[PDB]
Design a protein around this nucleic acid. Structure first.
Ligand SMILES: [Mg+2]
Ligand SMILES: [Mg+2]
Ligand SMILES: [Mg+2]
Ligand SMILES: [Mg+2]
Ligand SMILES: [Mg+2]
Ligand SMILES: [Mg+2]
Ligand SMILES: [Mg+2]
Ligand SMILES: [Mg+2]
Ligand SMILES: [Mg+2]
Ligand SMILES: [Mg+2]
Ligand SMILES: [Mg+2]
Ligand SMILES: [Mg+2]
Ligand SMILES: [Mg+2]
Ligand SMILES: [Mg+2]
Ligand SMILES: [Mg+2]
Ligand SMILES: [Mg+2]
Ligand SMILES: [Mg+2]
Ligand SMILES: [Mg+2]
Ligand SMILES: [Mg+2]
Ligand SMILES: [Mg+2]
Ligand SMILES: [Mg+2]
Ligand SMILES: [Mg+2]
Ligand SMILES: [Mg+2]
Ligand SMILES: [Mg+2]
Ligand SMILES: [Mg+2]
Ligand SMILES: [Mg+2]
Ligand SMILES: [Mg+2]
Ligand SMILES: [Mg+2]
Ligand SMILES: [Mg+2]
Ligand SMILES: [Mg+2]
Ligand SMILES: [Mg+2]
Ligand SMILES: [Mg+2]
Ligand SMILES: [Mg+2]
Ligand SMILES: [Mg+2]
Ligand SMILES: [Mg+2]
Ligand SMILES: [Mg+2]
Ligand SMILES: [Mg+2]
Ligand SMILES: [Mg+2]
Ligand SMILES: [Mg+2]
Ligand SMILES: [Mg+2]
Ligand SMILES: [Mg+2]
Ligand SMILES: [Mg+2]
Ligand SMILES: [Mg+2]
Ligand SMILES: [Mg+2]
Ligand SMILES: [Mg+2]
Ligand SMILES: [Mg+2]
Ligand SMILES: [Mg+2]
Ligand SMILES: [Mg+2]
Ligand SMILES: [Mg+2]
Ligand SMILES: [Mg+2]
Ligand SMILES: [Mg+2]
Ligand SMILES: [Mg+2]
Ligand SMILES: [Mg+2]
Ligand SMILES: [Mg+2]
Ligand SMILES: [Mg+2]
Ligand SMILES: [Mg+2]
Ligand SMILES: [Mg+2]
Ligand SMILES: [Mg+2]
Ligand SMILES: [Mg+2]
Ligand SMILES: [Mg+2]
Ligand SMILES: [Mg+2]
Ligand SMILES: [Mg+2]
Ligand SMILES: [Mg+2]
Ligand SMILES: [Mg+2]
Ligand SMILES: [Mg+2]
Ligand SMILES: [Mg+2]
Ligand SMILES: [Mg+2]
Ligand SMILES: [Mg+2]
Ligand SMILES: [Mg+2]
Ligand SMILES: [Mg+2]
Ligand SMILES: [Mg+2]
Ligand SMILES: [Mg+2]
Ligand SMILES: [Mg+2]
Ligand SMILES: [Mg+2]
Ligand SMILES: [Mg+2]
Ligand SMILES: [Mg+2]
Ligand SMILES: [Mg+2]
Ligand SMILES: [Mg+2]
Ligand SMILES: [Mg+2]
Ligand SMILES: [Mg+2]
Ligand SMILES: [Mg+2]
Ligand SMILES: [Mg+2]
Ligand SMILES: [Mg+2]
Ligand SMILES: [Mg+2]
Ligand SMILES: [Mg+2]
Ligand SMILES: [Mg+2]
Ligand SMILES: [Mg+2]
Ligand SMILES: [Mg+2]
Ligand SMILES: [Mg+2]
Ligand SMILES: [Mg+2]
Ligand SMILES: [Mg+2]
Ligand SMILES: [Mg+2]
Ligand SMILES: [Mg+2]
Ligand SMILES: [Mg+2]
Ligand SMILES: [Mg+2]
Ligand SMILES: [Mg+2]
Ligand SMILES: [Mg+2]
Ligand SMILES: [Mg+2]
Ligand SMILES: [Mg+2]
Ligand SMILES: [Mg+2]
Ligand SMILES: [Mg+2]
Ligand SMILES: [Mg+2]
Ligand SMILES: [Mg+2]
Ligand SMILES: [Mg+2]
Ligand SMILES: [Mg+2]
Ligand SMILES: [Mg+2]
Ligand SMILES: [Mg+2]
Ligand SMILES: [Mg+2]
Ligand SMILES: [Mg+2]
Ligand SMILES: [Mg+2]
Ligand SMILES: [Mg+2]
Ligand SMILES: [Mg+2]
Ligand SMILES: [Mg+2]
Ligand SMILES: [Mg+2]
Ligand SMILES: [Mg+2]
Ligand SMILES: [Mg+2]
Ligand SMILES: [Mg+2]
Ligand SMILES: [Mg+2]
Ligand SMILES: [Mg+2]
Ligand SMILES: [Mg+2]
Ligand SMILES: [Mg+2]
Ligand SMILES: [Mg+2]
Ligand SMILES: [Mg+2]
Ligand SMILES: [Mg+2]
Ligand SMILES: [Mg+2]
Ligand SMILES: [Mg+2]
Ligand SMILES: [Mg+2]
Ligand SMILES: [Mg+2]
Ligand SMILES: [Mg+2]
Ligand SMILES: [Mg+2]
Ligand SMILES: [Mg+2]
Ligand SMILES: [Mg+2]
Ligand SMILES: [Mg+2]
Ligand SMILES: [Mg+2]
Ligand SMILES: [Mg+2]
Ligand SMILES: [Mg+2]
Ligand SMILES: [Mg+2]
Ligand SMILES: [Mg+2]
Ligand SMILES: [Mg+2]
Ligand SMILES: [Mg+2]
Ligand SMILES: [Mg+2]
Ligand SMILES: [Mg+2]
Ligand SMILES: [Mg+2]
Ligand SMILES: [Mg+2]
Ligand SMILES: [Mg+2]
Ligand SMILES: [Mg+2]
Ligand SMILES: [Mg+2]
Ligand SMILES: [Mg+2]
Ligand SMILES: [Mg+2]
Ligand SMILES: [Mg+2]
Ligand SMILES: [Mg+2]
Ligand SMILES: [Mg+2]
Ligand SMILES: [Mg+2]
Ligand SMILES: [Mg+2]
Ligand SMILES: [Mg+2]
Ligand SMILES: [Mg+2]
Ligand SMILES: [Mg+2]
Ligand SMILES: [Mg+2]
Ligand SMILES: [Mg+2]
Ligand SMILES: [Mg+2]
Ligand SMILES: [Mg+2]
Ligand SMILES: [Mg+2]
Ligand SMILES: [Mg+2]
Ligand SMILES: [Mg+2]
Ligand SMILES: [Mg+2]
Ligand SMILES: [Mg+2]
Ligand SMILES: [Mg+2]
Ligand SMILES: [Mg+2]
Ligand SMILES: [Mg+2]
Ligand SMILES: [Mg+2]
Ligand SMILES: [Mg+2]
Ligand SMILES: [Mg+2]
Ligand SMILES: [Mg+2]
Ligand SMILES: [Mg+2]
Ligand SMILES: [Mg+2]
Ligand SMILES: [Mg+2]
Ligand SMILES: [Mg+2]
Ligand SMILES: [Mg+2]
Ligand SMILES: [Mg+2]
Ligand SMILES: [Mg+2]
Ligand SMILES: [Mg+2]
Ligand SMILES: [Mg+2]
Ligand SMILES: [Mg+2]
Ligand SMILES: [Mg+2]
Ligand SMILES: [Mg+2]
Ligand SMILES: [Mg+2]
Ligand SMILES: [Mg+2]
Ligand SMILES: [Mg+2]
Ligand SMILES: [Mg+2]
Ligand SMILES: [Mg+2]
Ligand SMILES: [Mg+2]
Ligand SMILES: [Mg+2]
Ligand SMILES: [Mg+2]
Ligand SMILES: [Mg+2]
Ligand SMILES: [Mg+2]
Ligand SMILES: [Mg+2]
Ligand SMILES: [Mg+2]
Ligand SMILES: [Mg+2]
Ligand SMILES: [Mg+2]
Ligand SMILES: [Mg+2]
Ligand SMILES: [Mg+2]
Ligand SMILES: [Mg+2]
Ligand SMILES: [Mg+2]
Ligand SMILES: [Mg+2]
Ligand SMILES: [Mg+2]
Ligand SMILES: [Mg+2]
Ligand SMILES: [Mg+2]
Ligand SMILES: [Mg+2]
Ligand SMILES: [Mg+2]
Ligand SMILES: [Mg+2]
Ligand SMILES: [Mg+2]
Ligand SMILES: [Mg+2]
Ligand SMILES: [Mg+2]
Ligand SMILES: [Mg+2]
Ligand SMILES: [Mg+2]
Ligand SMILES: [Mg+2]
Ligand SMILES: [Mg+2]
Ligand SMILES: [Mg+2]
Ligand SMILES: [Mg+2]
Ligand SMILES: [Mg+2]
Ligand SMILES: [Mg+2]
Ligand SMILES: [Mg+2]
Ligand SMILES: [Mg+2]
Ligand SMILES: [Mg+2]
Ligand SMILES: [Mg+2]
Ligand SMILES: [Mg+2]
Ligand SMILES: [Mg+2]
Ligand SMILES: [Mg+2]
Ligand SMILES: [Mg+2]
Ligand SMILES: [Mg+2]
Ligand SMILES: [Mg+2]
Ligand SMILES: [Mg+2]
Ligand SMILES: [Mg+2]
Ligand SMILES: [Mg+2]
Ligand SMILES: [Mg+2]
Ligand SMILES: [Mg+2]
Ligand SMILES: [Mg+2]
Ligand SMILES: [Zn+2]
Lengths: 53, 64
RNA sequence: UGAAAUACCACCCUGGCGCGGCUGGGGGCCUAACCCUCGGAUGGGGGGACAGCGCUUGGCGGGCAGUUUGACUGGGGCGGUCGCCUCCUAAAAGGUAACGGAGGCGCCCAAAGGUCCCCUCAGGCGGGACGGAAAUCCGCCGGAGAGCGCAAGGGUAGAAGGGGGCCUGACUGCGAGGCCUGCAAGCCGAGCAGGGGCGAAAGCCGGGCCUAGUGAACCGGUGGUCCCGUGUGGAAGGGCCAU
RNA sequence: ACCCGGUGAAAUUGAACUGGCCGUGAAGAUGCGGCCUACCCGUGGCAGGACGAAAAGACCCCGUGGAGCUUUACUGCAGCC
RNA sequence: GUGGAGCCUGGGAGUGAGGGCGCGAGCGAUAACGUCCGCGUCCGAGCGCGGGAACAACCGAGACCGCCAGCUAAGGCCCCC
RNA sequence: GCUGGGGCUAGGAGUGAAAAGCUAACCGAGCCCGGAGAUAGCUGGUUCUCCCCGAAAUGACUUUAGGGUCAGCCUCAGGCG
RNA sequence: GUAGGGAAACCGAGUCCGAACAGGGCGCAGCGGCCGCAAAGUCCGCGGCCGUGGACCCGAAACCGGGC
RNA sequence: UGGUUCGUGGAGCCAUGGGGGAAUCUGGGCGGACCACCGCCUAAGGCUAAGUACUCCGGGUGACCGAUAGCGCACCAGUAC
RNA sequence: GGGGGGAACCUGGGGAACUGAAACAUCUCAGUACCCAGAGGAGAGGAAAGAGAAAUCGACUCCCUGAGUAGCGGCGAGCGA
């Protein structure tokens, strides 16, 4: 992790709870990450969006 | 006079029914982002203190 | 006639001016609090609502006060060093020291990750416009001397290397059994369940060929949870999950 | 100073029946080994040794010891604004 | 393999300045009664005993007590002996 | 200039033609009593007898290095065999 | 002491994590012929050691208060 | 600011140095920020035995000392110095 | 009427430091030591603007307990209703 390589949270797009924490290079991947992850509250897979940490 | 209970131990630890000493696992207080789900999950549990350190701590818990 | 339409009186706007209420700054002056002084003192003179002093705000402040000012070390100082990875020293298990010999890390990758499918290097000889030692092309030889992001070692083409498609397992809830080990840590992990990815399938997938890329508590922030709530309902504030 | 008559201390002192050499030994031995030298006991003297006496090294280092001092070390206080 | 062997649980420690030697290395200079590890040993704690002239750790040997008894070890047998 | 008598100023304070000088024979902070049996991870000292067993000077971590905590190694009790 | 588990509400021979009736953590179970005997536990004596006190004894240089 | 277990904490209560400044039962304080409900209690005047503390003094008693002990002092001692 | 004295004991007004935190500043030692004012044979406190959940108790003081609980705490050492 550095200034360019940030830590970030993944928020379930449906119920809105952050379920995952990961990292990206916001110069290499300047867009908000969108990732299908398992959400344990919805208890199904859902698109997760990068949300500020 | 009478021994005083140590309150550092009292807030971190418990004497089990058979006299073991159980603490929360360490190392998920922060810096968790790059730690695998395996790391966070197994760190979310209690563990049994090794016998040398446990007997020391129970001596600090004279009235439990 | 426009969106609204006119004489007439309200209530209220806009912004401006005057008499004011009540204050906020400046300015001049007054005396009587307060201070200084005067043979004379229930007074006169000067200062004057300042100064002084009370509470409170921020600042300057070795004048004083309490202290702190690391360790290793062929004495101490000075210099060097302090965690982590690789090799050697290391006496063919493991481990093993010196201010012994040599290098690296404090990152990175949205693919450089999962899976399915295909592919195979470096190099040397010969041949081919611009074109060379080396760009691209063709043939022959060529087990790995190439490659695997970065040090070194191990490993490796019967791929961990190169290319493509679909993807997000860079899972959630756990976890038999181990490695290592003073503790605390650190490491590997089949298997079961949830909901998925790829594959016809057998299956694989809980990041990355591997070993560095890191930081126990305490205190606090943030999202969620809806567990506690100081007579009761809430609320304040905590707890738990995540970061 | 020395001798006689008078009075009469001191630090120090494990005990001592306390020699030389060459060695050995915690690395400089009267005390151990080998050899050598040596009858017993004093008095006046000299200071080489008893690592002689004195002072629990001031130098030096070590102690998460102290104290004086300094400053753009930290944090306070007085005083001043 | 029955040994002051081993294992489990608990009470009490002390030690965390080691040192010589042999061998295997690093450091040093194929120096040091040098230094730093490894395997071993002895002194430490066996400054008890014999030998090595004397001498913690080299050779011999693990001292319960007593004997004017015997056998040995290393080392010795010309005299001190 | 020196000196008698009579007075005043003191402990973070006095006084100092300045040496940290002097303040009742040792002043970089007087003396007395009190806090007080300050604290001393340091040095010293630690008292009858017999019997059994019997270490360590290592590893890890340490403002740690001549001190600690845990492990190793000793010992006692119960158990296993 | 007779109940534990859980941060807690709470449940209870279980409980916590979890969606789980899954898996796991921490928990739950005397001898002889009604008697004896033994025992959880607990009380008192004794002893080793630990905590708090100066805590085995002697020793600072210093710090502070009040006086001289 | 202090006091309390409460060290700024969600910080109430009790006390008050400063500023502002009420009401008289339809008044007021409290029940841990706050608000509502519910309940407790009557501030800004004073006094009040006993149970409690201590031991100069007197007495009684010791698995207390017995002249280096026990008070500093058994004695002409807070003396001699 | 007061003044001054009294071994401790008591209340009020002031109020340290060593030490402990294995350094140190918040914290601790401790509202202790000490100074001062006053009381008396005791002093203090005392008759709810209390407690705190008991649908309750019923001044104060003092002992046991509650309890090393609740909490407070560089959530450290420790402090402690
Ligand atoms: Mg604590
Ligand atoms: Mg943790
Ligand atoms: Mg942490
Ligand atoms: Mg957390
Ligand atoms: Mg947090
Ligand atoms: Mg990772
Ligand atoms: Mg993971
Ligand atoms: Mg994750
Ligand atoms: Mg979880
Ligand atoms: Mg209890
Ligand atoms: Mg209990
Ligand atoms: Mg004027
Ligand atoms: Mg005037
Ligand atoms: Mg005038
Ligand atoms: Mg004027
Ligand atoms: Mg003014
Ligand atoms: Mg103000
Ligand atoms: Mg100020
Ligand atoms: Mg300053
Ligand atoms: Mg200073
Ligand atoms: Mg101090
Ligand atoms: Mg420091
Ligand atoms: Mg330091
Ligand atoms: Mg040091
Ligand atoms: Mg040093
Ligand atoms: Mg050294
Ligand atoms: Mg050295
Ligand atoms: Mg040297
Ligand atoms: Mg040396
Ligand atoms: Mg040197
Ligand atoms: Mg240096
Ligand atoms: Mg390093
Ligand atoms: Mg090796
Ligand atoms: Mg090795
Ligand atoms: Mg090896
Ligand atoms: Mg080997
Ligand atoms: Mg091993
Ligand atoms: Mg070095
Ligand atoms: Mg480097
Ligand atoms: Mg791609
Ligand atoms: Mg790959
Ligand atoms: Mg080629
Ligand atoms: Mg060519
Ligand atoms: Mg060419
Ligand atoms: Mg050409
Ligand atoms: Mg290669
Ligand atoms: Mg490189
Ligand atoms: Mg692919
Ligand atoms: Mg698809
Ligand atoms: Mg395991
Ligand atoms: Mg382990
Ligand atoms: Mg690691
Ligand atoms: Mg890690
Ligand atoms: Mg599945
Ligand atoms: Mg599936
Ligand atoms: Mg599947
Ligand atoms: Mg399919
Ligand atoms: Mg798996
Ligand atoms: Mg890789
Ligand atoms: Mg990597
Ligand atoms: Mg802390
Ligand atoms: Mg917190
Ligand atoms: Mg919350
Ligand atoms: Mg409530
Ligand atoms: Mg609730
Ligand atoms: Mg309330
Ligand atoms: Mg309501
Ligand atoms: Mg409720
Ligand atoms: Mg609400
Ligand atoms: Mg809440
Ligand atoms: Mg829950
Ligand atoms: Mg978490
Ligand atoms: Mg004569
Ligand atoms: Mg004469
Ligand atoms: Mg003699
Ligand atoms: Mg003689
Ligand atoms: Mg010699
Ligand atoms: Mg000699
Ligand atoms: Mg001689
Ligand atoms: Mg002799
Ligand atoms: Mg001899
Ligand atoms: Mg001799
Ligand atoms: Mg001789
Ligand atoms: Mg002789
Ligand atoms: Mg001779
Ligand atoms: Mg003579
Ligand atoms: Mg002489
Ligand atoms: Mg002479
Ligand atoms: Mg001499
Ligand atoms: Mg001599
Ligand atoms: Mg001499
Ligand atoms: Mg001497
Ligand atoms: Mg002298
Ligand atoms: Mg001395
Ligand atoms: Mg000395
Ligand atoms: Mg010295
Ligand atoms: Mg001296
Ligand atoms: Mg010096
Ligand atoms: Mg030195
Ligand atoms: Mg020093
Ligand atoms: Mg230090
Ligand atoms: Mg130290
Ligand atoms: Mg110091
Ligand atoms: Mg100082
Ligand atoms: Mg001083
Ligand atoms: Mg001035
Ligand atoms: Mg046996
Ligand atoms: Mg044995
Ligand atoms: Mg044992
Ligand atoms: Mg014992
Ligand atoms: Mg014992
Ligand atoms: Mg030791
Ligand atoms: Mg020890
Ligand atoms: Mg040590
Ligand atoms: Mg050592
Ligand atoms: Mg040594
Ligand atoms: Mg050494
Ligand atoms: Mg050694
Ligand atoms: Mg040894
Ligand atoms: Mg050797
Ligand atoms: Mg040989
Ligand atoms: Mg050798
Ligand atoms: Mg050799
Ligand atoms: Mg070597
Ligand atoms: Mg040596
Ligand atoms: Mg040598
Ligand atoms: Mg050598
Ligand atoms: Mg050795
Ligand atoms: Mg020794
Ligand atoms: Mg021997
Ligand atoms: Mg032996
Ligand atoms: Mg010997
Ligand atoms: Mg001896
Ligand atoms: Mg011998
Ligand atoms: Mg001999
Ligand atoms: Mg001989
Ligand atoms: Mg010898
Ligand atoms: Mg020797
Ligand atoms: Mg011997
Ligand atoms: Mg024997
Ligand atoms: Mg014979
Ligand atoms: Mg022979
Ligand atoms: Mg011979
Ligand atoms: Mg003969
Ligand atoms: Mg004159
Ligand atoms: Mg005069
Ligand atoms: Mg005079
Ligand atoms: Mg005069
Ligand atoms: Mg004066
Ligand atoms: Mg003066
Ligand atoms: Mg004075
Ligand atoms: Mg002074
Ligand atoms: Mg003074
Ligand atoms: Mg000063
Ligand atoms: Mg003068
Ligand atoms: Mg005097
Ligand atoms: Mg003088
Ligand atoms: Mg001083
Ligand atoms: Mg001073
Ligand atoms: Mg003097
Ligand atoms: Mg006094
Ligand atoms: Mg004290
Ligand atoms: Mg003392
Ligand atoms: Mg000290
Ligand atoms: Mg033995
Ligand atoms: Mg060691
Ligand atoms: Mg450690
Ligand atoms: Mg360290
Ligand atoms: Mg170290
Ligand atoms: Mg030390
Ligand atoms: Mg130990
Ligand atoms: Mg053993
Ligand atoms: Mg043994
Ligand atoms: Mg046994
Ligand atoms: Mg519980
Ligand atoms: Mg279970
Ligand atoms: Mg019993
Ligand atoms: Mg113990
Ligand atoms: Mg003491
Ligand atoms: Mg004490
Ligand atoms: Mg004591
Ligand atoms: Mg003790
Ligand atoms: Mg002095
Ligand atoms: Mg001080
Ligand atoms: Mg000081
Ligand atoms: Mg001072
Ligand atoms: Mg004074
Ligand atoms: Mg207030
Ligand atoms: Mg307070
Ligand atoms: Mg407060
Ligand atoms: Mg708080
Ligand atoms: Mg409060
Ligand atoms: Mg209120
Ligand atoms: Mg006020
Ligand atoms: Mg108030
Ligand atoms: Mg009312
Ligand atoms: Mg009202
Ligand atoms: Mg009130
Ligand atoms: Mg109330
Ligand atoms: Mg009401
Ligand atoms: Mg009330
Ligand atoms: Mg009264
Ligand atoms: Mg009465
Ligand atoms: Mg009375
Ligand atoms: Mg009474
Ligand atoms: Mg009485
Ligand atoms: Mg009496
Ligand atoms: Mg008698
Ligand atoms: Mg007598
Ligand atoms: Mg006497
Ligand atoms: Mg007598
Ligand atoms: Mg008397
Ligand atoms: Mg007399
Ligand atoms: Mg008076
Ligand atoms: Mg009176
Ligand atoms: Mg008071
Ligand atoms: Mg007063
Ligand atoms: Mg006060
Ligand atoms: Mg007082
Ligand atoms: Mg003071
Ligand atoms: Mg202090
Ligand atoms: Mg102290
Ligand atoms: Mg302490
Ligand atoms: Mg203390
Ligand atoms: Mg300290
Ligand atoms: Mg300390
Ligand atoms: Mg200090
Ligand atoms: Mg302090
Ligand atoms: Mg205090
Ligand atoms: Mg007193
Ligand atoms: Mg009086
Ligand atoms: Mg009475
Ligand atoms: Mg009264
Ligand atoms: Mg009344
Ligand atoms: Mg209780
Ligand atoms: Mg206190
Ligand atoms: Mg109480
Ligand atoms: Zn969701």
């Amino acid at each position: 992790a550095s200034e360019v390589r940030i830590k970030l949270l993944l928020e379930c797009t449906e119920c809105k709870r952050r379920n995952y924490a990961t990292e990206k290079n916001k110069r290499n991947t300047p867009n908000k990450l969108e990732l299908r992850k398992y959400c344990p509250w919805c208890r199904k897979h859902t698109v997760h969006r990068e949300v500020k940490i | 006079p009478k021994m005083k209970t140590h309150k550092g131990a009292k807030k971190r630890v418990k004497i089990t029914a058979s006299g073991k000493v159980v603490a929360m696992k360490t190392g998920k207080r922060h810096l968790n982002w790059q730690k695998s789900g395996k790391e966070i999950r197994q760190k979310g549990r209690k563990f049994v203190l090794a016998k040398p350190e446990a007997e020391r701590i129970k001596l600090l818990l004279p009235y439990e």
